[PDB]
From a paper:
We substituted V612 in AcrB with F to mimic the sequence in the OqxB cluster and with a physicochemical similar (W) and different (N, A) residues. In contrast to wildtype AcrB, that crystallises in the LLL and LTO states, the V612F/W crystal structures were exclusively obtained in the TTT state. We thus hypothesised that the substitution impedes the formation of the L state and this in turn might play a role for the transport of L state-binding drugs such as erythromycin. As we anticipated that minocycline binding to the DBP might be a driver for the TTT conformation in the V612 variants, we solved the apo structures by X-ray crystallography. These also adopted the TTT state with an open, but empty DBP. Despite the high resolution of our AcrB V612F/W electron density maps (2.3 Å and 2.8 Å, respectively), no clearly assignable detergent (DDM) densities could be observed in the DBP. We therefore assumed that the crystallisation conditions might favour the crystal contacts leading to the TTT state for the AcrB variants. Moreover, the proximity of the bulky aromatic side chains in the hydrophobic cluster might introduce a steric hindrance for the rearrangements associated with the closing of the DBP required for the O and L state formations.
Resistance nodulation and cell division (RND) efflux pumps are secondary active antiporters that are ubiquitous across all domains of life. As part of tripartite multidrug efflux systems in Gram-negative bacteria, they span the entire cell envelope and export a broad variety of structurally and chemically unrelated toxic substrates. Substrates can enter the PD through several channels and bind to the access pocket (AP) in the L state and the deep binding pocket (DBP) in the T state.
Numbering used by the authors:
A (entry chain B): 1 to 1032
B (entry chain B): 674 to 817
C (entry chain B): 50 to 145
D (entry chain B): 866 to 913
The structure:
Amino acid sequence: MPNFFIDRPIFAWVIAIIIMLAGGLAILKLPVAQYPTIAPPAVTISASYPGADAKTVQDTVTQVIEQNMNGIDNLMYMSSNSDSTGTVQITLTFESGTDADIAQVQVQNKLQLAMPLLPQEVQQQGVSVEKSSSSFLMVVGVINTDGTMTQEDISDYVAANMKDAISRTSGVGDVQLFGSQYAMRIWMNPNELNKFQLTPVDVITAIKAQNAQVAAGQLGGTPPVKGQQLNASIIAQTRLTSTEEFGKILLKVNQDGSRVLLRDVAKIELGGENYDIIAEFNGQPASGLGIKLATGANALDTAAAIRAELAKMEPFFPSGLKIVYPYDTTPFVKISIHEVVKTLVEAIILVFLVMYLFLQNFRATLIPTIAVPVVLLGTFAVLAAFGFSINTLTMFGMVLAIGLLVDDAIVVVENVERVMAEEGLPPKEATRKSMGQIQGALVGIAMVLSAVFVPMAFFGGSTGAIYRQFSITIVSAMALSVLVALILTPALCATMLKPIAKGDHGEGKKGFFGWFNRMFEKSTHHYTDSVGGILRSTGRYLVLYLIIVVGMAYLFVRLPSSFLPDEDQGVFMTMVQLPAGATQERTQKVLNEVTHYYLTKEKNNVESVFAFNGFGFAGRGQNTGIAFVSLKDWADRPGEENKVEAITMRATRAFSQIKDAMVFAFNLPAIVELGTATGFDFELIDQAGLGHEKLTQARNQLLAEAAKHPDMLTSVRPNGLEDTPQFKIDIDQEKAQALGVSINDINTTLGAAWGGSYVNDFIDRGRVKKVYVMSEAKYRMLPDDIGDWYVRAADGQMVPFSAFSSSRWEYGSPRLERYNGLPSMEILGQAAPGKSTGEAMELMEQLASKLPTGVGYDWTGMSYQERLSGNQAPSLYAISLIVVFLCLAALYESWSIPFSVMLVVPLGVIGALLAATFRGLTNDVYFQVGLLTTIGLSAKNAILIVEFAKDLMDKEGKGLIEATLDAVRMRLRPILMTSLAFILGVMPLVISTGAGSGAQNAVGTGVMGGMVTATVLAIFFVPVFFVVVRRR
Amino acid sequence: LGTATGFDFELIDQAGLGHEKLTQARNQLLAEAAKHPDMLTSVRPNGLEDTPQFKIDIDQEKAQALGVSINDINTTLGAAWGGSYVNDFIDRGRVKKVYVMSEAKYRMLPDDIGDWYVRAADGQMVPFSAFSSSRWEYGSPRLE
Amino acid sequence: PGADAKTVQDTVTQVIEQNMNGIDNLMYMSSNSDSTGTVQITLTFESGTDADIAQVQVQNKLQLAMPLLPQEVQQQGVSVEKSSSSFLMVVGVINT
Amino acid sequence: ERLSGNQAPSLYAISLIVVFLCLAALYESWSIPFSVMLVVPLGVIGAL
């Protein structure tokens, strides 16, 4: 093939232009995103029961739904929680690669077999079923700068004049609002209600009667009498539309003839669906949205498009309204885009300076300046053909292939330039001999480099998806690289290079260009003499190779293995956890303090604080909170003390003075949609009918026995909440019957007043919203306000709860959890420093086996991936060893000559571990994938050294040490040009600081140090291996 | 696809403006478009125009005073003049619906409302005139 | 049965519409509420969208409102068909 | 149409460029293609 295109230089230019057309076409239209879909796909059912205790939500919604979640494909596990805000969240998680669409449908179908069995109050609130494994594209906030709009008002406006437009933008798939649209709110007053002998039942009945949309038919409708001229609709009651209309609802006519109006017993006012979340932005009332990225959509397109949408609307907002953007991925996506290209461009210049230093002409330097572009651009068309996206993982999978894409251009031009200066052939025929010496080896270089990266695309779980991103990007660029080294680069070597005379080693040049050729010719002389002097006692230099193998193995087992490094993303979280019982008002104080501190002590780094008094991550509740700190650009936050980690430490430390509470800051894990990070994830399970209490006691035993082994387990803790005092009102059924009081009237008097009640709908500026009845806070705050409420008996008398009820305080759960349909408590922790997570697990399991009879366990989340993915690495890379072995035996037609190539692996890796352990890095995914590219070039250099030394024996009749010392001479200059352009091209990634430094340093330090050793040592060890093997 | 040629415009109430106002605003555009016949021909709406409607308003205070249920009133009216599906029956061994409606004779003119009575709690028959009142108004036969 | 255009919109259409979000490849949604008591809501999608997957997602979101629709409407059947096809033939039936 | 008006000048532009590269591929020349590429109007004019 190379010869076909040497003589057709335009046909090969046509093909390389089309690879660039198909690959440039592939960049414009392909989805950009920070990552792809790594998390196993989950479906969440969510349901609300206004006014319900955690037990009620579980015993009338959760369990019902759960008991119907079977007969579903690829279901890994199901966890659910039932809190005391009346909310139920059931997450069903599935096998990796399950169809997110098919899973949602099957769930929905089984859910809907229980909908008829759910309470009506729950049905009316909406039992939603979304796809939960995605994560936030951006976050809009909305403030009013005149300060004339409750969060209620702003939320309504956002609900009525923003939310849909954004959710109809091209590429959006989910939008969540930080509030509700307005709700007509009747705030009952019990003093009045008793005055006129009325309960909240009368109110609710009036509202449903006087706020109604009645269908009344038509005058002159089908079927018609003959001779009819009029056809008109009959119109009757229409839903009320104003607080004024609502207040004018007639509840009762007095005996004298006076009217009892709704406004006579309650306070009508537009308000919210619920008041559980106060969301302040820099301590101002706010609303906003939590947008999400659609499956396979261009983050850049969508994100920009919204910003232009909001922009389109800003003229028309009410006075004061201001849109804010306290989070966006778009900057960090443009950053990573900018960072990878500004590393591939400096790699074309660093190969320009490297090529020009040895080959000393600009004609040769234009072939790798042209060759890498093609393989880069055209890998995108091969990734598009396989449905991959432009993501940090695929983008850094292309800077990690530089060593292999650049060697594929150096080995073609250097061998052409070498055959011309040693034999004296013209450019057109020296390329034919140069490319005959590396035709079958390059096809063998690719079949081997397949069997190295491809077994990693078969890894399982979330990890196996991360690996499937590099594995296909690299293999794609490399299969396109080896094809570019057989179509375009020999056509280029044959028409752009000028002749060199036989023997001219540039030793007759003056200036700086004379000195280097005379110092390198002797440097070639001194090296080939070393290899000789090394050959003398190869039995000595095989004993030193075993020190590299125990030094690596010793280094492999002491280097800690992480997942993916934490970046500074301009944003981070602080959690506020007041204790059990703490009113919203208290939690606000602490929250206002968190915002204050961030707006003074860190004014230079802090851009904004989005304070959410209502929900944390332990749960929702009046005692929890989350503050969202958005930092200024990384440009205005220079240094270490002005980057997230530093700021969080300062924070955690500064807040420890807070006495009546728990305030912690921390940083967002890299993959937000997985959290993971490290540690383990334990579930304690009531596998008999034991009970909440007993499961708690049993959870206690484990928590105490775990705190007595701090050597292995640190931070062993629960994730759920602790029992809280509750007020129980017990109805004496016999006393109620005796007085003529309905249990249903009693029950709704109580829950309507203290819990709230959705009654029906109304029209508010021509949109349908809900109407709710609740007591005005005055009479629903203390256990003694129950004496203010009365319930009307059949004889028509008003009766106080004290006449049929009694009360007492008790304890109960504010958050009942269930794991795979059984009661559970989820325990979180981490391995004490030094030990591995896996052995920490075995301790937990041992500890748990001791816990009382009935109490099972299991592992979820992370701990379920690893327990399902630990045996993969030794058996998949075993297959890798075997297939590359069969690829090398295929290239050298020998079951033994492969081994000489197969013995180069440690030489790079040892240096990679070294460079890693020195700097303070970890065995993370960027390390392991950088190892497979470091091994890929150190063995491709061994393939061309063993091919050049076995070709000298096979078709020229040279001896053993002759062919070895002759081949290592030919293959010296290319190994040096490659590894110099690759250590210097990777250098700015090793000294990389600021935005994106986790991913740059994790590839940089592992590739720079593993390339120092895969070139300095290999050159001395790959001739030894070829001799010890060829002689054995 | 229909398509053929021309254009397809949607005028949208992007505040809580109202049916009427959106209509007026639609009118302005339709008139200003008929003053440029050089560019735009046949500029027109696709929906329908407001039609007179008969509104029966129930005096809740008068109904309560007489002991007449709003639900009884409401279904007396809609069952009679609108129709009502009640339940199913078997017709030659297949299940079909059962509907109740007034015979056209008494559901054709606004004056046939005086023929309909609603029974109060005391057990008396009460005409709509004793708790209702009516008037003609305009409304949309097709809200888009 | 028996409803004025306003009633059909304020008790059926808007309810259903307010639940038609979180759906893939949705181009636009138009709907009409007439005085025959009928409601038609057309959701149109990107070209090449899966006619099966689109129907399912709609149905799923529709059904989160079914509990909030009037009983008179539920009993009549809230159907969800694929509307972009066209007539193969038309049979008529007379008695001579 | 508001979502499909820019397509024709840029898609047939790609068409010009790829056939140009196909003709340069057949005659091994970056200039001999143009002699083939200049026949388009001769038919089209008659079609109009």
